[PDB]
Amino acid sequence: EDVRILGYDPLASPALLQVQIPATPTSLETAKRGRREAIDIITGKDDRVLVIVGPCSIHDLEAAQEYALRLKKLSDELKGDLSIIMRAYLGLINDPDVNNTFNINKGLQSARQLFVNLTNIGLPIGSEMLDTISPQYLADLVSFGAIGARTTESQLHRELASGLSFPVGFKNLNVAVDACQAAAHSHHFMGVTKHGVAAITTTKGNEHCFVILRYDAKSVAEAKAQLPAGSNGLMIDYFRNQPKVNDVVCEQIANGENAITGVMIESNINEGKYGVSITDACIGWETTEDVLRKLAAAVRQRREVN
Amino acid sequence: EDVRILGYDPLASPALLQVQIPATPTSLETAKRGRREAIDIITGKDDRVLVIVGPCSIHDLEAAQEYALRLKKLSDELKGDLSIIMRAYLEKPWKGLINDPDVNNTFNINKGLQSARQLFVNLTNIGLPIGSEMLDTISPQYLADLVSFGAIGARTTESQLHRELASGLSFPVGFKNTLNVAVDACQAAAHSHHFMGVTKHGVAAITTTKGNEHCFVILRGTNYDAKSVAEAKAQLPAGSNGLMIDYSFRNQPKVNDVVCEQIANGENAITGVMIESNINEGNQGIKYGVSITDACIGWETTEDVLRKLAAAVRQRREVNK
């Protein structure tokens, strides 16, 4: 045993990291607001659209900060129509520098300082949950979670989602509806606690899971058919074909389509060195701005048909 | 904020369970040798077929002991041709023996862990190697000493956490399929990874793994016919291991005839097969020796499947001469 384990390195616990990099009272309030507002949208209490938007991944804290300032300025302008959460997708925990210098403790610390800095300016954040131990380190600052399409069918991720304190999306169709259904139940599994030791976790079940379609009226009505009683609304995942997607979705929204409650957009300062993604290609700020303005107007037109 | 965590209960650490339910010397030797024989077959040092066979899941220790006794006698007679490992699957994607060993809704995971480790010790103690589906990533810390073979289910092939787990496991791991996702998993598990994981004392740490050169692809579908198998060989990169065919219920014996006809005619790329088998055939809702999850063939059909496979392997040694 352990012939293929080189070794083990000490890891600060979540509790430890929360004392070292504590959240401000503004961060904490911003994360709680972003959850309430997402929950109101995806459960239909609220008629805005939730928009998850930002960089494919984060590699640079200042770049991230600047983006976060533009988006917060825009989010102020469009808040009658759109609830906005920044994708802060973390890559950074596993290797924060590079030259393959796998300094996970420095990675958790930066990841957490990043989340605290984002939410301190009143901008709620959303993340891909990949790992099942890392959310213990960051979850107090998150308002939204996505399970990637590689892991929608993974029992561990569905258990994880069940115990999360925020809405979680699952990417496609039957696997994603079976994921939401399984996340909604109580589960019992071996998990790591705040104090960094294994224990048996019992979860309550997450009634705020929803499907992410990764777009045309015919698809969406086929998607609505499959949806059990008790469903939340659909989210649409949108490099440069994202504005075309927007147009078709915007036209459903304006014409009365109430089952589309959210969208996701990969977007950075610049399109495709400062402010450009080192993973997937994203649209740049100015195309983001116009996608969003157009979404907002369509949400307005929608209050009108209703 | 913990609003959807009802709470936490205490969990015996792996180190503690290993002291309370120690492996015997025989147990430990049987696991070692199972790895060695698997390795030799999947890497083409040995011209036997690796056969992983047994129940879809185990819910009953005594029944599994009886099956194991029958398999192990059978394995003693066919061992010039087949190398046998018993499927001892304890986690199903009822979630199985660990999560709920009383199979009601009580979730006594500490009792599960103890029954699972007692199960594995009891099987390997008679000289019969075992193999299990690795779903949870903490549970292999409890049990890995006893294991000779590991499989990653088709739902978690593309999961990064499972490819990283596989990279650190001390035994060969199969990945389920189309093929690209299984090959990419094999390739990823071959590398060194760095992740947060749980140690033997039950604390989270940063694990660094070395990479696992003994990963291979399991074809599970029809995937098993000479044309599909040639299509799989042409996807396979330079350092590839051999292919394993999953027979999965009443059709298992027809799959076996087609695979056996390939083998006996000289197909050297089929090194293993996987067979869902129990004392008695079929399944039941939540009766002795009958599966409570997927339907299995019963012992009598299994003996005959494995006798026919053994003969195809003898016949293949003939062709390669």
Residues of A in Cβ contact (< 8 Å) with B135: 155-156
Contact B204, B210 (CB under 8 A): no
CA distance B82 to B309: 8
Q: Is the dihedral of CA B257, B258, B261, B266 positive or negative?
A: negative
Residue of chain B whose Cα is closest to the Cα of A158:
B93
Check B3 against A94: CB less than 8 A apart: no
Residues A204, B93: C-beta atoms closer than 8 Å: no
Q: Which domains does chain A have, with CATH numbers?
A: 1-306 (3.20.20.70)
Q: At what angle do helices A61-77 and A104-120 cross, to 10 degrees?
A: 30
Across the interface, whether the CB atoms of A164 and B204 are under 8 A apart is answered: no
With a CB cutoff of 8 Å and minimum separation 6, the contacts of B74 are B84, B303, B306
CA distance A134 to chain B (A): 8
Q: How far apart are the first and last CA of chain B?
A: 67
| Pairing mode of beta strands B270-276, B49-54 | parallel
CB-CB: which of B9, B170, B195 is closest to A3? B170
Q: What is the CB neighbour count within 10 angstroms for residue B210?
A: 16
C-alpha count within 13 angstroms, C-beta hemisphere, residue B192: 9
* CA pair distance A52, A71, nearest whole angstrom: 11
Tokens of B35: 């790895």
On whether the CB atoms of residues B64 and B296 are closer than 8 A, the answer is: no
Answer yes or no: do A190 and B11 touch at CB < 8 A: yes
Q: What is the amino acid identity at position B162?
A: H
Residues with Cβ < 8 Å from B225, sequence gap 6 or more? B258
Distance, CA of B4 to CA of A202 (rounded, Å): 9
| Contact check, Cβ <8 Å, B5/A196 | no
Q: Which residues, 6 or more positions from A273, have their beta carbon under 8 angstroms from its beta carbon?
A: none
| B223 residue type, one letter | N
DSSP track, B181-192: HHHHHHHHHTS-
B2, B3, B4, B212, best to mutate vs chain A, most A CBs in 10 Å = B4
In which element (H, E) is residue B258 found? helix B252-264
Tokens of A185: 């139940």
Cβ proximity of A129 and A164 under 8 Å: yes
What gap in Å lies between CA A242 and CA A267, rounded to an integer?
10
In angstroms, the separation between the Cα of residue A149 and the nearest Cα of chain B is: 9
The one-character DSSP state at B144 is: G
> Tokens 């048996």 sit at which residue?
A200
> Which three-class secondary structure state does DSSP give residue A82?
strand
Residue A172 tokens, joined: 């496609």
The span from the CA of A36 to the CA of A169, in Å, is: 15
Q: In angstroms, what CA-CA distances link B232 with B178, B227, B242? A: 9, 9, 11
Mutate to test the interface with A, among B1, B32, B138, B145 (most CBs of A within 10 A): B1
How far does B181 lie from chain A, in Å, by closest CA?
A: 10
Task: At A84, give phi and psi (nearest 5°).
Answer: -115, 130
- Between the alpha carbon of residue A56 and those of residues A125, A232, A283, B195, B242, the distances in Å are 13, 25, 10, 21, 37
Cα A153 to the center of its chain, rounded Å:
18
How far is the CA of B79 from the CAs of B37, B49, B50, in angstroms? 11, 10, 10
Nearest CA in chain A to B138: A190
Burial of B142 (0-12, 13-18, 19+ CB in 10 A): buried
Tokens encoding B55:
């129940």
User: Are the C-beta atoms of residues B269 and B298 closer than 8 Å to each other?
Assistant: no
**Using the beta-carbon criterion (under 8 Å), do A5 and B192 form an inter-chain contact?**
no
* Structure token digits, residue A146: 């996505």
Q: Which of B135, B138, B170 is the closest to A198 by Cβ?
A: B138
Q: Are strands A260-266 and B49-54 parallel, antiparallel or unpaired?
A: unpaired
Query: With contacts defined as CB-CB under 8 Å, which chain A residues touch B167?
Result: 4
Contacting residues of A for B208, CB less than 8 Å apart: 5-9, 102
Per the CB < 8 Å rule, is B159 touching A165? no
CB contact under 8 A, A5 and B207: yes
Name the amino acid, one letter, at B263. Answer: I
Q: Which of A105, A153, A190 sits opposite B139 (nearest CB)?
A: A190
DSSP conformational letter for A183? H
DSSP B43-58: TTSS-SEEEEEE-S--
Resolution (A): 2.1
Question: Based on the number of CB atoms within 10 Å of its own CB, is B286 exposed (0-12), middle (13-18) or buried (19 or more)?
Answer: exposed
